[PDB]
Structures are given as C-alpha cells and as structure tokens.
C-alpha cells in the first residue's frame, strides 16, 4: 500500500480485458458490471507482483500468471518460478480504464495515483473516442510513472496495429499519457499477458514513495450498499477499499478531522474535532502486515460512527493528519484554463473547441474545488485568476483544480487546469 498505479487508453476495441485481465483481483462493486466498454471509478485491486529471475515475474499466484485477451492462444514469455511465490506487501497495481463517468472520483482520488499501468487499443478511426475527453480528468493525478501500452500488435492489420497509438503518444500529451511508453501488453492482441508483471510492473514500477509522511488521508470512496431493513452487525467504521490521497498507516495513527460536520456557525472558517480513525486495518495482499505507508491503494477500515459517510459521502472529504494545516477555507485563490481539446465530443474543424467564456450571476457554475465539484451563482471570473469560494469547507492541505462543466446538458466536459492556493 506504499505505491499504486492507474491507467489510460483509447477506445472502440472492447476493454473487457484492459479492465481485469492481469489486474490480480477482479473489478466488481455494487452494480459494477466490470466492463461493458470500460470502468470509471479508480479503486484498489489487491495483488502483489514480484519476480523470480525468469522471463516473467511470478504474480501473487504461486503457480503462474496469464491473461484473458485471447480465445485459443497468445504467444508469451516464460512464467517465472513457483514455490509459494514471494512478494513484499500490498504493492497495488491499480487501473483506470477508458471511461470517464466518475470525474468526481477522477479528481478526488486521481492525485493519489503513483504509477500508471495502462493499455492502448488499436481499433481506432480518425476521431478519437477516448483520446478526446478521457484525458481531461487525470491530468494532475500525480502519477509521474505511466506506460500507455499499445494493444493491437498481431490481430489488427498494419494500418490498425499502429494506426493511432503513435498519433496519441504524440497528440494525447495534454495529460500525462503521451509521455508514457508502450510496455509490452495488449487488450487487442494479447501480447505476453504474463510478461506484464515484469515488463510493466518494473517499467512503471512502484516509484520511491513517501515512507513516514503526514497521515493526510483524503478518502476517495466509501463502501456500503446493503439493502434497507439493516442486517445483524453492520455497525462499524468505514470499510473503504480504494486509493486514499496520502497517509502513513503506521502504529497508532489518527485523523484531525477538520471538514467533518458543519463547523460552529458554519459560515465560518476553522474548527477543532479529532475523531480517531484507528489504523490497524490494512492487509498486505499476502499477510497481516499493516505497517503501511502513503502512496498505494488498499482496503482501509475507519473507526467512527458510519451513519454520516458509510454510504457515498466519503469522497472529496478527508481524514486528518499530523500538522493540522489543511485549508478549510472555501474563499481562497484558484485558477483554471479554457478548452483546447473538446471534451465530450470533438471535431476536425475547430468548431466545438475554439471559443471560451467565463461565468456570471443569475446562473449556476460547477467547478471542481480540490476534490469536490460545487459552486453556483458566481460573482465574476478573470482571465486566468480566480477568487474561488463555496458553501462548505473542502478541507485539504491545498486547493487544486476546477471543473469546466456546469449544469449544461445531459453530460459534462472538462477543460480546466490546476492552481493551488
């Protein structure tokens, strides 16, 4: 749980493999349906990849490692070595597929992405399905490590196995996707799904991460969907398996909960209420080793009354840390950028991406302050300067990012940039 991963890639080939092919743990939640086209939430898949000095790294499975992107055969390298395959801990290798229906999570939990182990299909036409809007959410996701793995290598023809992969590794650079290489993997040719535990988990390996830093936990997701008429013994803390922003889950941690409930006369600024969220719950994907570190993606369990946030209420908020800095002050400074790559749909004539505008009154304006998208009737807006404000304390140690999607139409877009106060 010290360093995790993410993903990004084009569309229109079928990502029933780029979601859960060799992710270690499957992808399923309350009404998830792992991959119709792609998934949208950025979570935590429990698995521990490790090598044994043989041409591929033995997966957390102590016998072999393979994928599900071929129906009869897929040429691949050697598997590694058996013998109760070793590992360190829950070194998450998470994946964010080619769907963008979770921009709230794709802006809250995005910035907790350490690496990015991805795939990039090769069944693309001239207009870009997932290379025109799906790069407008994880632009500042703090994942310097990334590998946009080309997929079509044997099945797509010469003019599809290399059609838009390079034309995105050069023209999908608005976010950190082009600067990512193509480590040998495939969601359209099944290129050595075993070698994706060494040539991927070591090409974008778990970067040197924070080992004892602040427990600045900004919870990205919460887990409770049980049916009404509550069950026997569902009175506990969080239960949340995902990617928390930061946090040293060391011996005896706590959470200086600044945002929490409404502060005293909550048109105010500050508060003081630590509700200890004990740190004992982090299984390291192979053993009960919870001496974790900030950076990864794991399944944490809080210690609070669950009522307030057992359901989807612990995304955007935070669990406090040492160094009680976090900026619970909506009225701060923040900035954003306009549209150059058209989000939601695009064109090749500068027709749906040329113009830009600002906000005003007698209207509504949704902006993604830090993790939470809120706003409304804005006073004004400058060229590239913003006097950002809101109606609640979005308490994080900083104040990044915005949302270029108010209440507009059936869907939403993203054109902004990142500015911290």
């Amino acid at each position: 749980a010290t360093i995790n991963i993410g993903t990004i890639g084009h569309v229109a080939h079928g990502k029933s493999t780029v979601v859960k092919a060799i992710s270690g743990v499957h992808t399923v939640r309350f009404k998830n349906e792992l991959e119709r086209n792609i998934t949208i939430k950025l979570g935590y898949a429990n698995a521990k990849i490790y090598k044994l000095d043989d041409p591929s790294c033995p997966r957390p499975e102590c016998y072999r490692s393979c994928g599900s992107s071929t129906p009869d055969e897929f040429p691949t390298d050697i598997p590694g070595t058996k013998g109760n395959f070793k590992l360190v801990r829950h070194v998450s290798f998470v994946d964010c597929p080619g769907h963008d229906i979770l921009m709230a999570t794709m802006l809250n939990g995005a910035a907790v992405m350490d690496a990015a182990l991805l795939l990039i299909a090769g069944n693309e036409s001239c207009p870009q399905p997932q290379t025109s809007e799906h790069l407008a959410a994880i632009e500042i996701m703090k994942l310097k490590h990334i590998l946009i793995l080309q997929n079509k290598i044997d099945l797509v023809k010469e003019s599809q196995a290399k059609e838009q992969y390079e034309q995105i590794l050069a023209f999908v650079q608005g976010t950190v996707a082009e600067g990512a290489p193509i480590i040998p993997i495939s969601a359209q040719l099944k290129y050595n799904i075993e070698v994706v535990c060494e040539y991927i988990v070591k090409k974008i390996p778990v970067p040197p991460r924070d080992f004892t830093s602040e427990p600045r936990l900004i919870v990205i997701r919460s887990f409770d969907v049980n049916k009404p008429g509550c069950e026997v013994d569902d009175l506990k803390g969080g239960v949340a398996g995902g990617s928390i922003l930061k946090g040293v889950l060391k011996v005896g941690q706590e959470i200086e909960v600044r945002p929490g409930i409404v502060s005293k006369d909550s048109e105010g600024k500050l508060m003081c209420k630590p509700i200890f969220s004990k740190i004992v719950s982090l299984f390291a994907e192979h053993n009960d080793l919870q001496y974790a570190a900030p950076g990864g993606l794991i399944g944490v369990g809080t210690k609070i009354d669950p009522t307030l946030c057992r359901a989807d209420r612990m995304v955007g908020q935070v669990l406090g840390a040492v160094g009680a800095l976090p900026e619970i002050f909506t009225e701060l400074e923040i900035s954003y950028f306009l549209l150059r790559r058209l989000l939601g749909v695009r064109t090749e004539g500068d027709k749906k991406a040329a113009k830009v505008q600002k906000l005003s009154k007698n209207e509504v304006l949704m902006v993604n302050i830090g993790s939470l998208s809120t706003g409304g009737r804005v006073s004004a807006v400058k060229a590239d300067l913003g006097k950002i404000v809101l109606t609640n304390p979005v308490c994080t140690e900083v104040g990044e990012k915005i949302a270029l999607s108010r209440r507009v139409e059936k869907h939403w877009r993203l054109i902004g940039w990142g500015q911290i106060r």
Binding site: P75, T76, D77, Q150, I153, D154, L155, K157, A161, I182, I183, P184, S186, L189, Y191, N192, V195, Y199, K203
Partner: peptide, 16 residues
C-alpha cells in the same frame, strides 16, 4: 522491451 516486438514479429502471419 524484448517481448512486444517478439509478439509483433512472431504472430504476424497467423494472427490476421
């Protein structure tokens, strides 16, 4: 690295 080009040049004929 040494496996992407290997897949690409060893499944070119069989895989259409």
């Amino acid at each position: 690295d040494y496996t992407y080009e290997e897949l690409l040049n060893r499944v070119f004929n069989i895989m259409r």
